[PDB]
GROMACS .gro file of C-alpha atoms in nm:
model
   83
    1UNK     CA    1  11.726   9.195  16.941
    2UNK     CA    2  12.120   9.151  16.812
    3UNK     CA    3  12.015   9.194  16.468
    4UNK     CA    4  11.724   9.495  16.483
    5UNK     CA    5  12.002   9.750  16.414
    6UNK     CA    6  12.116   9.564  16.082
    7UNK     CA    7  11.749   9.499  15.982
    8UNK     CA    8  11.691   9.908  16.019
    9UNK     CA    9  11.937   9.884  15.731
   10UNK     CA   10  11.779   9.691  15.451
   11UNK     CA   11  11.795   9.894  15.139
   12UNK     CA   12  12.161  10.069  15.187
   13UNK     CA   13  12.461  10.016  15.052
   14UNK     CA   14  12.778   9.877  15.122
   15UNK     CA   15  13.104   9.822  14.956
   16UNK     CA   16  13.239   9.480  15.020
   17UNK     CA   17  13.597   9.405  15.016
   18UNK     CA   18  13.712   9.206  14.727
   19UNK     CA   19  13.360   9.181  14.567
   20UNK     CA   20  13.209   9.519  14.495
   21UNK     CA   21  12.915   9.774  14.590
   22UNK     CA   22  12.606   9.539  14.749
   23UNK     CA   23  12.232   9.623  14.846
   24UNK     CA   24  12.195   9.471  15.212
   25UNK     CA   25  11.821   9.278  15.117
   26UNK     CA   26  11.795   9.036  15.431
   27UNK     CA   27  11.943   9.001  15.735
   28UNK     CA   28  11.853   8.643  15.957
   29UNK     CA   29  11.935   8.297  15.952
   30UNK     CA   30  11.967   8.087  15.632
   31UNK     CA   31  11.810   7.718  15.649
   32UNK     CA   32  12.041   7.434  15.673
   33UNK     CA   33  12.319   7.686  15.745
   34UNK     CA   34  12.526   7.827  16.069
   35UNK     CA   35  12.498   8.174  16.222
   36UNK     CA   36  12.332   8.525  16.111
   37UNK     CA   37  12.378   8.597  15.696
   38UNK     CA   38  12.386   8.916  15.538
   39UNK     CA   39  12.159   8.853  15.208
   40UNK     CA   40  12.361   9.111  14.982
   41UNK     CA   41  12.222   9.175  14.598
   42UNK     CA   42  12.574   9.284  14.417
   43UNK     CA   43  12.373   9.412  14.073
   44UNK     CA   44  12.582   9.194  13.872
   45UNK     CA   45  12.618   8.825  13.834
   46UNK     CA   46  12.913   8.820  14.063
   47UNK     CA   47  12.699   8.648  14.329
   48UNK     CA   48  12.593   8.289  14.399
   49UNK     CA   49  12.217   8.312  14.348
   50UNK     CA   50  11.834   8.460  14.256
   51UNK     CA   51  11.797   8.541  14.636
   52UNK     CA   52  11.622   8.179  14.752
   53UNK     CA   53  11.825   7.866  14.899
   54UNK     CA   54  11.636   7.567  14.927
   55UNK     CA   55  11.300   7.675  14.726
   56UNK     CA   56  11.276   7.968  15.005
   57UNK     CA   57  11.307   8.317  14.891
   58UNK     CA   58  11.492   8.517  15.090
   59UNK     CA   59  11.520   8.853  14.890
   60UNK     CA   60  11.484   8.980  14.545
   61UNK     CA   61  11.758   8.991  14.313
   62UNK     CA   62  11.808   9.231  14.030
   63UNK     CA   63  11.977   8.929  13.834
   64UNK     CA   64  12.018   8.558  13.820
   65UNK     CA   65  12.302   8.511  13.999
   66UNK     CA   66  12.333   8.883  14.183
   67UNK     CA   67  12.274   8.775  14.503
   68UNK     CA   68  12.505   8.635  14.802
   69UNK     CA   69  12.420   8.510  15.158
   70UNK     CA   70  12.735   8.648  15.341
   71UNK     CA   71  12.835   8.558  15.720
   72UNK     CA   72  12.705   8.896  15.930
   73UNK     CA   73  12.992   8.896  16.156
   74UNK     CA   74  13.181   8.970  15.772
   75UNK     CA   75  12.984   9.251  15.740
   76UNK     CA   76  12.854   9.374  16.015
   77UNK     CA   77  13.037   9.708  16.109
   78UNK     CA   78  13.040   9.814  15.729
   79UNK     CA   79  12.642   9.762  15.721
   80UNK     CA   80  12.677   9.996  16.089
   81UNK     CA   81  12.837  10.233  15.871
   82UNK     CA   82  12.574  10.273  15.607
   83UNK     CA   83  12.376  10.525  15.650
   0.00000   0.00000   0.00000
């Protein structure tokens, strides 16, 4: 599938433009929502959210507000990159 080669790499690290060094913790669709999402912990509460939308847990955040559902087209060739 499209999205097995981002899955393979859950638990890197990537530096997002304009927001900082992120953990990639999910990669998949978000309910309610359009597209693929990169579920990103940032380690800081720089993000949006605890990792869950909509009473669903998605991933685990270090902090309250650490984590970030970002569009996977944003970040897909820097999550390529990881290693």
């Amino acid at each position: 599938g499209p999205m097995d080669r981002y899955q393979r790499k859950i638990g890197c690290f990537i530096q997002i433009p304009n927001l900082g060094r992120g953990q990639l913790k999910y990669v998949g669709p978000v309910d309610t929502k359009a597209g693929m999402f990169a579920g990103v912990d940032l380690l800081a509460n720089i993000g949006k959210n605890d990792g869950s939308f909509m009473g669903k847990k998605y991933f685990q955040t270090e902090y309250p507000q650490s984590g970030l559902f970002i569009q996977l087209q944003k970040v897909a060739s820097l999550i390529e990159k990881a290693s």
